[PDB]
Amino acid sequence: RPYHCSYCNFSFKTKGNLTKHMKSKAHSKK
Ligand SMILES: [Zn+2]
Q1: Which stretches does the record call C2H2-type zinc fingers?
Q2: Interior angle at CA 11, CA 5 and CA 16, nearest 5
């Protein structure tokens, strides 16, 4: 699963999704 948050453990299956997390104001300015 090459799609794990840079903080949580919210894993996805693709980029469109992982990005959806890094898209919203989740928590990844780094
Ligand atoms: Zn996260």
Answers
A1: 3-27
A2: 80
If you measure from the C-alpha of residue 18 to the centroid of ligand 1, how many angstroms do you get, rounded to a whole number? Answer: 9
Provide the Cα torsion 13, 14, 16, 20; round to 10°: 40
Residue 17, CB half-sphere, CA atoms under 13 Å: how many? 10
Domain that holds residue 24: 1-30
Which CA distances in Å does 17 have to 7, 11?
Answer: 15, 9
Other CB atoms within a 10 A radius of the CB of residue 10 amount to: 13
CA of 28 to the centre of ligand 1 (A): 7
